[PDB]
Design an enzyme around this catalytic site. Structure first.
Site, PDB file in Angstrom:
ATOM      1  N   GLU A  35       0.846  -1.294   0.025  1.00  0.00           N
ATOM      2  CA  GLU A  35      -0.144  -0.077   0.114  1.00  0.00           C
ATOM      3  C   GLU A  35       0.879   1.332   0.061  1.00  0.00           C
ATOM      4  O   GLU A  35       0.478   2.223  -0.724  1.00  0.00           O
ATOM      5  CB  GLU A  35      -0.987  -0.155   1.220  1.00  0.00           C
ATOM      6  CG  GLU A  35      -1.855  -1.168   1.203  1.00  0.00           C
ATOM      7  CD  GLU A  35      -3.008  -0.686   0.161  1.00  0.00           C
ATOM      8  OE1 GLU A  35      -2.837   0.460  -0.575  1.00  0.00           O
ATOM      9  OE2 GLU A  35      -3.904  -1.806  -0.239  1.00  0.00           O
ATOM     10  N   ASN A  46      -7.727   9.241  -5.634  1.00  0.00           N
ATOM     11  CA  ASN A  46      -8.618   8.446  -6.471  1.00  0.00           C
ATOM     12  C   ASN A  46      -9.477   8.957  -7.482  1.00  0.00           C
ATOM     13  O   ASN A  46      -9.777  10.160  -7.319  1.00  0.00           O
ATOM     14  CB  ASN A  46      -9.528   7.379  -5.414  1.00  0.00           C
ATOM     15  CG  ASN A  46      -8.741   6.771  -4.179  1.00  0.00           C
ATOM     16  OD1 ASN A  46      -9.014   7.053  -2.976  1.00  0.00           O
ATOM     17  ND2 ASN A  46      -7.733   6.179  -4.717  1.00  0.00           N
ATOM     18  N   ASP A  48     -12.492   9.027  -7.840  1.00  0.00           N
ATOM     19  CA  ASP A  48     -13.779   9.748  -7.271  1.00  0.00           C
ATOM     20  C   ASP A  48     -13.536  10.881  -6.707  1.00  0.00           C
ATOM     21  O   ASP A  48     -14.414  11.576  -6.008  1.00  0.00           O
ATOM     22  CB  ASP A  48     -14.629   8.605  -6.656  1.00  0.00           C
ATOM     23  CG  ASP A  48     -13.938   8.174  -5.286  1.00  0.00           C
ATOM     24  OD1 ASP A  48     -12.444   8.507  -4.905  1.00  0.00           O
ATOM     25  OD2 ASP A  48     -14.493   7.274  -4.424  1.00  0.00           O
ATOM     26  N   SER A  50     -11.718  11.044  -3.771  1.00  0.00           N
ATOM     27  CA  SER A  50     -11.331  10.928  -2.423  1.00  0.00           C
ATOM     28  C   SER A  50      -9.716  10.559  -2.453  1.00  0.00           C
ATOM     29  O   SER A  50      -9.088  10.477  -3.636  1.00  0.00           O
ATOM     30  CB  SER A  50     -11.992   9.518  -2.010  1.00  0.00           C
ATOM     31  OG  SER A  50     -11.590   8.305  -2.712  1.00  0.00           O
ATOM     32  N   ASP A  52      -6.396   8.373  -0.210  1.00  0.00           N
ATOM     33  CA  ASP A  52      -5.589   7.439   0.648  1.00  0.00           C
ATOM     34  C   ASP A  52      -4.462   8.087   1.427  1.00  0.00           C
ATOM     35  O   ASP A  52      -3.750   8.826   0.902  1.00  0.00           O
ATOM     36  CB  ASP A  52      -5.657   6.089  -0.121  1.00  0.00           C
ATOM     37  CG  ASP A  52      -6.367   5.360  -0.725  1.00  0.00           C
ATOM     38  OD1 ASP A  52      -7.697   5.786  -0.373  1.00  0.00           O
ATOM     39  OD2 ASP A  52      -6.355   4.342  -1.831  1.00  0.00           O
ATOM     40  N   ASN A  59      -9.154   5.387   3.278  1.00  0.00           N
ATOM     41  CA  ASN A  59      -9.589   6.217   2.269  1.00  0.00           C
ATOM     42  C   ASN A  59     -10.544   7.262   2.918  1.00  0.00           C
ATOM     43  O   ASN A  59     -11.427   6.948   3.703  1.00  0.00           O
ATOM     44  CB  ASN A  59     -10.428   5.379   1.416  1.00  0.00           C
ATOM     45  CG  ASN A  59     -11.027   6.088   0.202  1.00  0.00           C
ATOM     46  OD1 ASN A  59     -12.283   6.635   0.494  1.00  0.00           O
ATOM     47  ND2 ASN A  59     -10.555   6.320  -0.839  1.00  0.00           N
TER      48      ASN A  59
END
Ligand code: CL
Ligand code: CL
Ligand code: NA
Ligand code: NA
EC number: 3.2.1.17
Length: 129
Positions: A35, A46, A48, A50, A52, A59
């Site tokens: 990750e 991301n 959309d 959002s 991380d 998220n």
């Protein structure tokens, strides 16, 4: 902070992740490697809108507030910046909530694609724990 492998394993043990909800320590170390490359400062946007955050790439749509993810939830009740600290406590406490929400570690895409079904104990081999 960029952790070493065994240093992170020991920190995650100290914080109660070994066998948490049945996931052995190597699963958590493997997930963190893929990750974030063990970097607490990691961030990634991301599609959309959002973002991380941190060692476990938590998220903002669901778990933390970053002030720029409309309609999102803050289910861990923390600013997302708290997840970038050299102290992993907030990331671990939020991850415990995530892994308990019914889907286990499948919530982490890199875990499902790169750790699940592999010899995850190798990630803690050689470490003093
Ligand atoms: Cl820590
Ligand atoms: Cl599970
Ligand atoms: Na393990
Ligand atoms: Na949010």
């Amino acid at each position: 902070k960029v952790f070493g492998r065994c240093e992170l394993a020991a920190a995650m043990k100290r914080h109660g992740l070994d066998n948490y909800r049945g996931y052995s320590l190597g699963n958590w170390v493997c997930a963190a490697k893929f990750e974030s490359n063990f970097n607490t400062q990691a961030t990634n946007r991301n599609t959309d809108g959002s973002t991380d955050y941190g060692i476990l790439q938590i998220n903002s749509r669901w778990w933390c507030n970053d002030g720029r993810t409309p309609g999102s939830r803050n289910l861990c009740n923390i600013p997302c910046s708290a997840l970038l600290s050299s102290d992993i406590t907030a990331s671990v406490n939020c991850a415990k909530k995530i892994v308990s929400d019914g889907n286990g570690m499948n919530a982490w895409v890199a875990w499902r694609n790169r750790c699940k079904g592999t010899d995850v104990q190798a990630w803690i081999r050689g470490c003093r724990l």
